[PDB]
């Protein structure tokens, strides 16, 4: 079970490297939802981000090679919580729960 963080202030990166075909995804700020990201903070359409809730949220990896890891810049204690990387393929998805803890 992936857990990331430590001190508030620095950036933190939540890793997510998926399998299967290159496809669209969403980052959820909250536990993994069953059928979408109920509190989606990042959305991709193919290999490019079409929505991000906060300018602090960046996908810095190679999306064409299935790296949709989320970097949260300028972190604060309140960023602590569970997040979900949800990758949506044709008729199935993969999701990865990640815990963030920042003091």
List, as one string, the DSSP characters of 41-94.
EEEEETTEEEEES-TTEE--S-GGGTB-PEEE-S--GGG-EEEEEEEE-SS-EE
Closest by alpha carbon to 54, among 80, 79, 36? 79
Domain that includes residue 13, residue range: 1-103
Experimental technique, in short, is: X-ray
Give the CATH number of the domain where residue 68 resides.
2.60.40.10
Question: CA–CA separation, 16 vs 44, rounded Å?
Answer: 14
Q: What's the domain count of the chain?
A: 1
Q: What is the phi-psi region of residue 26: left when phi exceeds 0, alpha when psi lies from -120 to 50, beta otherwise? A: beta
Question: CA–CA separation, 53 vs 66, rounded Å?
Answer: 21
């Amino acid at each position: 079970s992936v857990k990331v963080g430590g001190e508030a202030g620095p950036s933190v990166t939540l890793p997510c490297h998926y399998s299967g075909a290159v496809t669209s995804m969403c980052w959820n700020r909250g536990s993994c939802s069953l059928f979408t990201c109920q509190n989606g903070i990042v959305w991709t359409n193919g290999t490019h981000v079409t929505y991000r809730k906060d300018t602090r949220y960046k996908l810095l990896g190679d999306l064409s090679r299935r790296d949709v890891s989320l970097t949260i810049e300028n972190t604060a204690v309140s960023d602590s919580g569970v997040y979900c990387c949800r990758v949506e393929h044709r008729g199935w998805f993969n999701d990865m729960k990640i815990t963030v803890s920042l003091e």
